[PDB]
Structures are given as structure tokens and as C-alpha cells.
């Protein structure tokens, strides 16, 4: 028997619209670090000034990077006292967790603080935490940390995202999507933190993807705050989650590979992450653009007709899906004003573009917080190789 | 404040309740006699000198609510990893290459047999969920899982790292949000948890240490939630009605966990049995309010509902039946899997449910969960964190 007791009502009360984005908040350390000198910092903190062929690879990583600053909770007081941190590889895990246990938290608070002013609702407000870092791992962990800092109700259901990478601006777009879409009255505060003090090392001659990530990874915060039925005259609607969708992309095995050692985090690429996304990305957006508008002539929005969030994992991951999908120059601007402005903050770089994207829209008096259009993108990229797609639709401006 | 006009639903949602489909478990194969483990953990870990401390461990065990644990160390591995069975010895990156290989191969033992008695495709599964406290690596458990069970590309995961004891009814939480707002889903949940990362030898100035020696053990549990199941081709077993996180008060500090150098070490700082069972009351009376009103003879008492309660040790039992005055038949489920397999961790809980559900159908029991109609599950941890999860039987 497939026997059932009688049904009864739905016990919790689920929502009836879209999951909705209703405000954006960001947060970066206070040390900035200018990319065109950042090779001589490096290689002087690092005491391998003798390595000078070395310094030039790097100097040309960093000149080719697409970055013009980052910020950092580092700096050289912080690495002269940490000698083993400036080494390519001596044991550390434990002065980098002390650090970032402490400070993902602190930039999340920050973040999160601007995102619940803009909100303009009691803190109280809030059911749902969801809390993403690569940066460290405690328990009890960042997101009761946050709780804590933040001084919300104990009662919140919080979700602890540790150590997932780069895609993960995407996932937790698609984990509090069904939060606040099942769950009325749900208010969900998404806060990504990273800091690089996990992934911070000297040079070595021999592991030049370990070199390309001191020139690409940036520390941020940002947080957003998502509901569904957004309050009419209270709360201020700007993105709505419709789609979401991951995918392991074919041939990808060790793409991107990550592990937490006693030396830290460590960070290897060995397939050529660019072609492997440019090549799948096509049948990923085709895929999920049948879902959402269904295949009728007219019906379908190009992909220059969209606007686009796309996860700047370094300058060539843009160009490549700019070529393979023949996107016009201005499909990917905000997405490489972010990488230009802070660098690869991993899972935070989403939220940032989605923030630049309406702040720009707003300043230009452009019909929509999408760039003036409807539908548009959120697109995650990392170990996997996982992407993380969001299928996202703006709200009308006044022009 | 504009939106532009509503349209339906872009991912259809399902309509009746979470539930659960179909459950399995596995444990690795070295089982420990808890009566002799001191004999062999002081000896491991070359403690015999430690002549009193032993003592105190022989008689930690015996009042331990624990027959036997199994593990994935053993004496073999252990003579080979010397930085494991002393006190505090840089030993993170072996633990890290025990774990990631064998946390989410244990987690594919118990997902085969779940999918096994689900019996539907696995191509079926839309959603993963993993969740552990043994280990961290990027891609995670999640991904690893996926490719051992040759589960399609596209499955929509979600990876629970360091989470800690209470995550069995985290899990449940996130299981429910995504199968009934996604028809069709179905979520492949799976904790798996090793002590290999928590091993360690004595230290005579750490006694809440020595705690987590005498109660951790090693399994993995798996579980297949969706909602509205296929008429006359799946199988209820359990309905998931309410969920709710509480960190009690007062508490701060009383269970942390730090992964170092040295592995993943445990503190304890509070009275846990005290607030669990001095905070449980208001929580459950919270629960009981949302899900069944205030009124006279609408309410079960909480000696008429099944228990699924997280066995973090016996003197949390112990003093939750006490303080809720529940009849002593009401934690024997949990303390039989404790008795079984010691503290599992997030896993413990699914253990239960399975148990509780097996020994229903042997017993002719009128449901699923020791013929009650509602019944509870209880995850305690770190925060200290306090999941609670409303759950209904099926009839038999």
C-alpha cells in the first residue's frame, strides 16, 4: 500500500510569486593595491626579488589581467609578521584561519548592514541567512558568526556554504530561490565573503596557475536581501529569479581544482578553463532560454537582447563567450567594470556586477534595472567544471 | 517600487508535502567493541602509561550508551600514521586525504542502496544535497558523488561542509524548500561522516577531548525526498510538515569546533545536556502551536508522537526525557542507534528514521513511526544550534 494518513493543509504557508532581489549591499578591506605595481609589493614581500624572470611572467600576468585595483584584508605589516604565509609553501592553515575566521564574518557584517538599511525593514525581519565563503571554515560556523554580529533573531534558518569556489555567486541565487518561494513572509539575507588570506603565497618557478591567482583573487563582501510577494509601498523590488540551472560541463575533470592543506589553499588549474565554457556555454543558454520563453518565433530573446552577469573568472573566460556566442562589446562591460574595479572576488563578484548593473541603469536613465532590458543572466563558473546559470528578469525604470 | 506584469510560474512547484521515499545506510567495515576500546585505544596510541586517565576512559565507555562503533581506521592505518595517534601532531593534510577519497564513497555505499529500494531511474534525481564534517575539498563530496553514481551532469547540488551534529535536520530542512517548490524534484540527500578527521590521542588536560573518543563513530545515510509521489509507484514512508532552528539561550561557546593543523578538534564549554534539555521545552511547545492550534484535544502530548532525536550522548536523552517527562519507551530508538553505532553525527538521525520505520513493519505496527501519526526529529550542535523537524507517519 501506498497508504497516507488524510491530507492536511500546507503547515507552513508557501509564497505565490517570484523569489525577489530587494536590496544589494558591498563591502571590500580598507588596503588597496594598484595592479600595475602589485609585481614589485608581491615579489618584495615575498623576499624573491632575485627571481627576475619570474617577475617578469608575473608582471605580464598582471598587466594582461583586466584588473586595475583590489583590496585586500592583507597588508605588509599583517605579512612581514607572517613569514610562513609569505613563503610559496611552509605550513600556515593556522595563522589563516585565525584570520579569516574572524574577518570573513566582520567584511560579511559590513556588507550586509548596507543591504539592510537600503531594505529600510527591522532586522528582526530576516528568517533566512545564507552565508558563502571559500575563505576558512569554523563551527560553529561565519553564518551563526554573522547571526551574532548582526544581532538577529535566534530563530533564523541559516545555511553554512563553505568552501565551494567561484560558482557560488550562482548557487546562492538558486538556494534562495526556493527559501523565499516556499515560505511566505520569508526574507533571506544571502551574504558571500572572501578574503584572500587563505590563498596568499610566495612565487615558485615551477606552479605558474598558483602564480595566476595571486594576480587574479580580491577580497569582498556583498549581500543581498530576497523575498518573494514583495510588500507594495514598503519594499523596492530590482531583480526576480525565474530559472536556475547547473551543469558539470563535458571534458572538464580538474579544471579547477582546489584543496585546503596545512599550507593553506592551494589552487591548480590544469585544462583550459576559457575554451571549456566558451565551447558548452551555447547549449547551457539554449537549453535554458527553451524553459523560459519556449521556442515561438519572436518569443525568444537573443543574447544580445539580454543583460548579462557573468562571473569575470579572469579577462579571457569574458572574451571567449563574447566570441563564441558573438555578443557586442557592451554585452560584457559591466561584468569587466567589476573585474577592472576589484578583481575576482569568487562567489561575491556576481552580486557585485548584478549591483553596478542597476546602479548604472538608474544613473542612466535607462527603462529598466537591467540595462533597459526584461530578461537577463547570472552566470556562475568553477570547480567542476560546475556552471551555475540564473535566467533573471529587471523591474521598469522610469526613463 | 514597479514590477512588470506577473506571469505564471517559471519552474512549476509541487503541491502536497516533502516526503521522504526511501532510505539506506552503511558504515565501514572495522567494528570496535566499545567494553575493550580502551584496551585498544590506549595502546594505539601508546597512552599506557597514563594509568588513571585510563580509568577514567574504561569508565566513559561503559556509561556510554554505546555496544560498538565502526570505523574506517584501524590498527593497521594507525601504526602507519603516527601524527594521528599522538595528542597534537601536524596531521590535517593525511586526515584530508583519508576523508575526501573516503567520506564520499561511504555516501555512494548508502546512496546505491537508497536508490536501490526507490527504485525509480537515477536519472530521476534532479537534486544532491551532501553533508559533512569530515574533510573539505573543491570540486566537493557533492561532485565526487555524482560521478560514482553516474547521476546526470545537470543534478543541482548542494554541498554541506563542517557542519556539525545538528545538519541531520538541516538537511531535511533544505530538502523540503527544494522538493515542493520544484515538481518533479527528487532530492538525493546524503550525510557521511569519519572520525578520521576527530582521531586523536589523550591528553590528560583535556578531558572534553577525550569525550569525542568514547562517542564518535563512523556511516553514512541516504535518503530520497520529493513531493507528490508517482501513484502506485513510489513509496511514502514519512511526511516533512514543519521545520524550525533555534540557537538556545545562553549557550554561546558550549560546542566549537576548529579545523587546524592538528585535525578538527572538539571543545566543550557548557552544560550541552543542561541547555538542550532546559531550552527543549519552549521550542517543541513553539512547534507543536504552528503545526496543530491551541485547543483542547487537538494536541498530541509528546508521549503520543515518535522521537528521532540526535544521540550526541547519552545524557542528552537522558535529560530531555526527564525534563519533557516522557516515558522512558520514547528515546529507545534513539539510544538503539546509539547503542549500535555510537554518535554518527549529522548522520545519527537518518539511522533512526530507518530504524524506527524497520522495526514499525517487523513489529505490525499501525505506522511507520511506532504507530503514531506525528513525530519528531531533533538535531543538536554547535551555536548551540537546535533543528527541529515536524514529521508524519504513514499507516501500515
Given at each position: 500500500n501506498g497508504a497516507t494518513f488524510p491530507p492536511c493543509a500546507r503547515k507552513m504557508e508557501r509564497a505565490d510569486g517570484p523569489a525577489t532581489v530587494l536590496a544589494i549591499g558591498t563591502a571590500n578591506p580598507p588596503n588597496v593595491f594598484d595592479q600595475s605595481t602589485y609585481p614589485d609589493f608581491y615579489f618584495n614581500i615575498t623576499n624573491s626579488n632575485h627571481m627576475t624572470d619570474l617577475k617578469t611572467k608575473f608582471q605580464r600576468m598582471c598587466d594582461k589581467s583586466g584588473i586595475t585595483k583590489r583590496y585586500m584584508y592583507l597588508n605588509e605589516e599583517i605579512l612581514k609578521a607572517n613569514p610562513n604565509m609569505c613563503?610559496?609553501?611552509?605550513?600556515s592553515l593556522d595563522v589563516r584561519q585565525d584570520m579569516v575566521v574572524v574577518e570573513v564574518p566582520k567584511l560579511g557584517k559590513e556588507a550586509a548592514t548596507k543591504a539592510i538599511k537600503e531594505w529600510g525593514?527591522?532586522?528582526?525581519?530576516?528568517?533566512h541567512v545564507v552565508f558563502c565563503t571559500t575563505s576558512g571554515v569554523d563551527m560553529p560556523g561565519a553564518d551563526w558568526a554573522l547571526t551574532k554580529l548582526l544581532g538577529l533573531r535566534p530563530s533564523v534558518k541559516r545555511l553554512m556554504m563553505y568552501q565551494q569556489g567561484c560558482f557560488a555567486g550562482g548557487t546562492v541565487m538558486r538556494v534562495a530561490k526556493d527559501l523565499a518561494e516556499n515560505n511566505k513572509g520569508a526574507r533571506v539575507l544571502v551574504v558571500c565573503s572572501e578574503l584572500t588570506a587563505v590563498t596568499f603565497r610566495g612565487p615558485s618557478e615551477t606552479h605558474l596557475d598558483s602564480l595566476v591567482g595571486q594576480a587574479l583573487f580580491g577580497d569582498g563582501a556583498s549581500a543581498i536581501i530576497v523575498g518573494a510577494d514583495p510588500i507594495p509601498e514598503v519594499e523596492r523590488p530590482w531583480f526576480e529569479i525565474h530559472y536556475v540551472a547547473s551543469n558539470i560541463l563535458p571534458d572538464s575533470d580538474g579544471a579547477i581544482d582546489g584543496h585546503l592543506r596545512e599550507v593553506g589553499l592551494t589552487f591548480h588549474l590544469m585544462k583550459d578553463v576559457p575554451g571549456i565554457i566558451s565551447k558548452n556555454i551555447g547549449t547551457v543558454l539554449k537549453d535554458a532560454f527553451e524553459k523560459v520563453f519556449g521556442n515561438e518565433e519572436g518569443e525568444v530573446p537573443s543574447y544580445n537582447d539580454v543583460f548579462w552577469i557573468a562571473?569575470?573568472?579572469?579577462?579571457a573566460i569574458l572574451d571567449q563567450v563574447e566570441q563564441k556566442l558573438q555578443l557586442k562589446t557592451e554585452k560584457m562591460a559591466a561584468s569587466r567594470q567589476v573585474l577592472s574595479d576589484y578583481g575576482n572576488m569568487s562567489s561575491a563578484c556576481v552580486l557585485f556586477i548584478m549591483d553596478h548593473l542597476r546602479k548604472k541603469s538608474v544613473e542612466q536613465k535607462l527603462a529598466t534595472s537591467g540595462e533597459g532590458y526584461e530578461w537577463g543572466l547570472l552566470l556562475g563558473f568553477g570547480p567542476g567544471l560546475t556552471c551555475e546559470t540564473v535566467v533573471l528578469r529587471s523591474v521598469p525604470l522610469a526613463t
Open positions: 613563503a610559496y609553501w611552509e605550513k525593514q527591522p532586522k528582526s525581519k530576516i528568517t562571473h569575470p573568472g579572469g579577462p
